[PDB]
Design a binder for this molecule. Structure first.
Ligand SMILES: N[C@@H](CSCC[B-](O)(O)O)C(=O)O
Ligand SMILES: N[C@@H](CSCC[B-](O)(O)O)C(=O)O
Ligand SMILES: N[C@@H](CSCC[B-](O)(O)O)C(=O)O
Ligand SMILES: [Mn+2]
Ligand SMILES: [Mn+2]
Ligand SMILES: [Mn+2]
Ligand SMILES: [Mn+2]
Ligand SMILES: [Mn+2]
Ligand SMILES: [Mn+2]
Lengths: 309, 309, 309
């Protein structure tokens, strides 16, 4: 089969609300491990990463906690390279999407040929100089794209970073709130994306066929799914830091993941931006967490038509 | 036109919660008859079947109320054969889906060439030996399929049963919670099914075109729609005994039924698993019942584009 | 670019509930102007039309307030012809859809070649003689269609009306509650329509491609989008006078409008039937209004993939 390599990443300094740290904990408490075990893959829990805080982490321009966000990805990258070394799918239950920098970097150190599918309401492709909020959870892709090196200033904390993925190797699914600058980068660099407009016109079925043919056409290769829980509509994942109406349906989230599983090329997965302290009610938290687990489970074989040994 | 042959079937011993008996009553009280009359078909109410209880109905292995569930279908089968004899569409407003055994049997005694469309979140294809719950409302198809005879043990109450439908003659629409054994039967026997995954990939439009071409391709023939209210999402039919998230939308339920009506081959209909005592609030009950009536009405001509004489 | 010509039309006598008058006000207070200004079009606010009441406006048969509804459209028509004269897109934030009579008339006096896309749960094609409610907000299309002249009796208030649009030049999107007589007109006249049934079968993507090819096939030409807020499901626009379940999703409303914008042929827009006094709660009002603004904004360039100068 395909072994699972779990990695906790309770980090929240890539953004303002500290609750996303709760992510790994709640995800675990929801029985994620035994459910993956109920399925058919070996679960190797590498535990939760201990991110020692950086006492004097002054901002870079408008960018906050640059050193914390940077060392957090650095640790994670080395962590992801090890699970991928022990021949496994890296499964990061993170806090804020700024961790994708480390997740994808450590992943690419083992399989530099990987292609990325980014399910998000946002592009998270802002740079230190285009950012207006200064939150690093909305800039991970800029530090990763090869075509943007030269546009990324040397920020404290990211000297280790080497642009690992090119414009032609990533696909966005679910966009609906892209910054004017981010949109400029999408269109200028020619990044493949399926915003809600496209999902509406093609239907999720044609969307998945097209993103997979676009990435797996010429050559088969490792697939890194970075999944931001806010890619789905707030009625399904309300306990997230930046929710936007008109998102992917419960069902569309499962299709995406069931189709990615079937390629048999999943190599790394990120389950990001879940923040239970942001659910209106205790059920809003339970709804967001269960949808996140259901999502993760489809990535590893859980199919709605059924399964059997 | 096409005459309607209504049949009440207030039976609940095919499962654990006794409220599904309420089905016929609430469905009637919702004005189902006068609304069908407002449309263009003759309504002949054969009343509600009186299912005398079996005093000493001991279990078969783990299967409960086998004799009650069996005689309930037996009566219903003979009842369905009569309405189909008086040249009409049999319309069973049942309790639990175990009644499908009788509905489809009595139907096939008149038109053994019928093809079946099973709208459900479940396959209900468990046998007495594969069942874990032992509830007969999740085993009707096994007693019906010809390819499973030889696998079905002789259960008290079903000596009258003769496998009437073959694997190649039934289509599932809406699956999302199939047991590991049920999935084995689907795949082994090669039963046509459109789980939520397929509905997501093809869209309900291609799904209906494909299930109808699959059943009505070679030859036109009587169509039996067995509709489990839980085939639709709990946000539309919450007052049911086994609800599952990610189901058919209000709109998708109507399309299915509007397309089935248009074939002009509807011959039998089952409106199952509605249980008002299971609605959280009085409106949860009203929502589930009205959606059930709206569904039944589309089966008989009610179209969203409009109608006229 | 394409200049915007805003027109307030706080009129409610085309129907029974007086709250729709609130429309222009709430729509404005929601920041509609500055948001359109944030985009890329010149906003010229022609203010809100003052509809002096007609003291002795007795009914025509069963038709109520004929003289008020008629003079309201008459003023509006002359108003719409002026904005269209100052080279702009007429944007009417009305009350009840009876105003479409004036909106489309004054529009056609400037561009008689316009084609119409009518997003509604209803056809609003009843005549004075087929109407049963006698509310003029459900009869605007009959006074407009050229093929129905001869069927429209001379009603007090509409002597100025000259059938401006032919059957072949209008497309309906979202129908789900058409009167038996209205359906007769649709089918008899051969009006192009995509009811919810079609939206379900084709998907909104094929629907928009087909309605645009149907109208913009032979020749490009001015497009008048008359948008009834009730065309969308009540879960998105609950504060409307005649809501019907099974409507267009939040996302489908945006696709329609994003695709219409892209043709670059939008010439007139009506944002009708919003009635805040009909929202159950203050958020039901806010939900209906924001969805209406989001809709209007997509008509003028707001795209979910993003925008930039
Ligand atoms: N465009 C916004 C996006 S914040 C959302 C971040 B994330 O996708 O990770 O939740 C920015 O620059 O902060
Ligand atoms: N697979 C379950 C299904 S229970 C649902 C039954 B019915 O579809 O009729 O609601 C079982 O064997 O009890
Ligand atoms: N068919 C109904 C429709 S009322 C709905 C009007 B409107 O679409 O404008 O909201 C009638 O004749 O009053
Ligand atoms: Mn993100
Ligand atoms: Mn996001
Ligand atoms: Mn069932
Ligand atoms: Mn079921
Ligand atoms: Mn209208
Ligand atoms: Mn309407």
């Amino acid at each position: 089969s395909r072994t699972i390599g779990i990695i906790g990443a309770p980090f929240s300094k890539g953004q303002p609300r500290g609750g996303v740290e709760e992510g790994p904990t709640v995800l675990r408490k929801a029985g994620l491990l035994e459910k993956l075990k109920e399925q058919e893959c070996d679960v190797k829990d590498y535990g939760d990463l201990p991110f020692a805080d950086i006492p004097n982490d002054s901002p870079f321009q408008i960018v906050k906690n640059p050193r914390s966000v940077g060392k957090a990805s650095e640790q994670l990258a080395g962590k992801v390279a090890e699970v991928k070394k022990n021949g496994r799918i890296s499964l990061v239950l993170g806090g804020d999407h700024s961790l994708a920098i480390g997740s994808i970097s450590g992943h690419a150190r083992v399989h530099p040929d990987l292609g990325v599918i980014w399910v998000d309401a946002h592009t998270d492709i802002n740079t230190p100089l285009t950012t207006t909020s200064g939150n690093l959870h909305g800039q991970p892709v800029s530090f990763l794209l090869k075509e943007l090196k030269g546009k990324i200033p040397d920020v404290p904390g990211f000297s280790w970073v080497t642009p690992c993925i090119s414009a032609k190797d990533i696909v966005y699914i679910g966009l609906r709130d892209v910054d004017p600058g981010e949109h400029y980068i999408l269109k200028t660099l020619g990044i493949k994306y399926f915003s809600m407009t496209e999902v509406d016109r093609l239907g999720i079925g044609k969307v998945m066929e097209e993103t997979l043919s676009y990435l797996l056409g010429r050559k088969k290769r490792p697939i890194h799914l970075s999944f931001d829980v806010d890619g789905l509509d707030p009625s399904f994942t309300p306990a997230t830091g930046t929710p936007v109406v008109g998102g992917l349906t419960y069902r569309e989230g499962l299709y995406i993941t069931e189709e990615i599983y079937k390629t048999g090329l999943l190599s790394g997965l990120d389950i990001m931006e879940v923040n239970p302290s942001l659910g209106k009610t205790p059920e809003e938290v339970t709804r967001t967490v269960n949808t996140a687990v259901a999502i993760t489970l489809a990535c590893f074989g859980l199919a709605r038509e059924g399964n059997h040994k």
